[PDB]
Design a protein around this ligand. Structure first.
Ligand code: EJ1
Ligand code: EJ1
Lengths: 381, 381
């Protein structure tokens, strides 16, 4: 039995065709090439500027990309080397302030593990409550919770809140003095475009927002996670941050600031979303007619991953992933995302898209052949 | 608030001052031995792409084992790789709490070691750094039955206290005899004067241990760092579980870049690449403070850390007040009381001045520091 999704992902790192973890590792495209050709420029940029100036410069470049004037305005933020570090500091804050916390389900499981490790009193809430107004109202009205930890858009389902859904969420939390923790790790893949920072700040609620470069720009896990919070909790949030970190890397900030700038210059679609679409189509076309059904609906966004229903095969997720491993292919069994109800959700695997290009395409062809060979060996049984 | 609550808070404030001698992160200029690395950053970007994460983890660990000439470290696969040394300490603290280990922490110590253990809920007691050099005092500590784990820093920051081989062997013998777990922070290892194989001694003894390494105080890579966390076989499963709650991995680019810095240091020697410049800077600040009434902390048993620990008793000023006066002259130093994390009020007579700052800022700032010190003292008379 696996302890966690990360245990599976670590094992996957040793496989020929690794589709387990969702960290961005695709090849540098035509537009980002110039950045690698000029690494020395960003090394020099880091040397020539103060740590506070580089922090603000990256934050503001990101605010320009997502067109949030509210984020551009605020100085209440810190810079972590990883998004999991931002999540963990938030969990330390929730425990310190004694906030009973409802955590979205499904979720990448280390969100639950970090909250649990920090001593947070955790309960589950269905991601679909973000799209059902009175299901959400009952959750926040119960007097059972003081905070709501969500992921938007959500991993692995691509569930994404509309502007009106997000406004309703903030209004309900405001009326019940509920703190919102908002994990925006997959923001750039979303289909929506509204200023969620503006809605949060104008409401007056306490909140933390977590951003991440690591699922989006392929920088070999040299990452930046912005952790942004309301004025009223900034002193304590910053104190907890400083127990761990003095700062992140000025080199990493200068480098990632340019990745963000290039994405702004050529747009999201040409630099990120079109590639995700093409790789999505590759898997869909490969699995057509096999009985494996890619999860899809009208409302979801396209994450850098595919959520696949394998129920037609008669295997559960852990079983099927074990067979694929004998063919040098590593996938993520899906049950762990349903961290409060794993055994009711054993029919899915997750396959990540943003892998090294040659490995990815060769690997999907091997995956199609392995599925074929696995199912035909099952006809002989 | 009006006062300082942590060394990191003072260091953050110091980031905005013209002459910042506060934090101890390596920020000196790239010397002639390292310039070829920066001139060819693309080579290490490419190397990170060309190797799997586990194989680059091992390649860095092995290159470091070569530099420190430890066949034991070279042999072991029980280790994880963190982006910062603070992350490694935090995971160790989480392990101490999970395993219900009453922990004696060295005093003095850089204060976030104390803060992290306290934040994780560890049951903390202080022990005098001088116990490491007095056999009877250490034996009383481990045989009391009041502790289960001993957290030490060797060589110690800010005093430069360093264990001899026979002193280290005695420590391990005594902890073994009382089943005390050793947590060994070797952040400043490369500055020590000794050369023995501590990994061999720990492995041979059979005790439970974690060793923490760091590049950040030694090689100037703009806080793009690597921290090896190496541990005994018997605790490897649980240590790796806690690591994997927070990290999948660190950066392969970071590992490739830092591996070269290590390799070059091993090729040309730690004196030519590191220690010689440290000597020049220590002599520089020693000559500047001579005859001021400020007493540089010194003895014939310490090693030379990249920092200067200074008794300001003769000023009549306490450390925070004196640091406040220097700030008025655009000079940031570290008040020493927070290093005595269990007894701050009894140790207010020291400041710490870091040495490995950008070259022109350092030598110019020592001149400004001498002038500010002279002017502040003349006004008292
Ligand atoms: C919604 C969300 C995630 O899905 C997520 C991570 N997802 C992963 C790999 C996690 C690897 N394991 C770990 N970080 N302990 C995935 O494969 O989708 C993180 C943290 O990102 P970092 O791993 O710290 O860079 C934050 N929010
Ligand atoms: C013995 C030791 C230290 O002295 C130390 C840090 N010393 C510092 C700056 C710490 C800045 N603040 C922080 N990490 N929250 C000094 O100025 O000496 C660390 C952690 O290293 P990192 O800061 O995480 O890179 C581990 N072991």
């Amino acid at each position: 039995r696996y302890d966690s999704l990360t245990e599976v992902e670590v094992e996957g790192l040793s496989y020929l065709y690794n589709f387990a973890d969702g960290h961005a590792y695709h090849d540098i495209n035509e537009h980002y090439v110039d950045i690698i050709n000029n690494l020395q420029r960003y090394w020099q940029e880091g040397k020539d500027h103060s740590i506070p100036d580089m922090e603000k410069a990256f934050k503001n470049q990101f605010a320009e990309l997502i067109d949030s004037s509210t984020l551009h305005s605020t100085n209440h933020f810190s810079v972590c080397p990883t998004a999991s570090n931002s999540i963990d500091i938030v969990a330390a804050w929730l425990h310190k302030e004694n906030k009973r916390t409802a955590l979205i389900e499904p979720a990448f499981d280390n969100l639950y593990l970090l909250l649990k490790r920090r001593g947070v009193d955790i309960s589950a809430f269905d991601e679909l409550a973000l799209k059902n107004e009175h299901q959400l109202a009952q959750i926040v009205s119960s007097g059972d919770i003081d905070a709501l930890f969500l992921v938007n858009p959500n991993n692995p389902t691509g569930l994404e809140m509309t502007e009106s859904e997000f406004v309703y969420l903030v209004e309900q939390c405001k009326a019940h003095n509920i703190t919102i923790l908002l994990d925006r790790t997959f923001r750039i893949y979303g289909k929506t475009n509204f200023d969620d920072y503006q809605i949060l700040e104008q409401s007056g609620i306490d909140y933390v927002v977590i951003e991440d470069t690591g699922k989006t720009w392929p920088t070999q896990d040299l990452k930046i996670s912005l952790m942004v919070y309301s004025e009223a909790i900034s002193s304590t949030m910053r104190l907890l941050y400083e127990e761990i970190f003095l700062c992140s890397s000025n080199f990493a900030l200068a480098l990632l600031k340019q990745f963000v700038a290039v994405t702004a210059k050529f747009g999201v679609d040409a630099t990120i979303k079109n590639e995700v679409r093409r790789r999505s189509e590759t898997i869909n076309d490969a699995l057509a007619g096999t009985g494996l059904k890619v999860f899809d609906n009208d409302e979801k966004c396209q994450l850098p991953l595919c959520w696949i229903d394998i129920s037609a095969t008669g295997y559960d997720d852990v079983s099927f992933a074990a067979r694929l491993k004998e063919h040098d292919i590593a996938v993520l069994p899906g049950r762990f995302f349903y961290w409060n109800s794993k055994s009711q959700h054993t029919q899915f695997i997750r396959v990540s898209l943003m892998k090294p290009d040659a490995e990815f395409y060769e690997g999907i062809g091997k995956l199609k052949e392995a599925v074929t060979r696995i199912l035909e060996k099952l006809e002989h049984h």
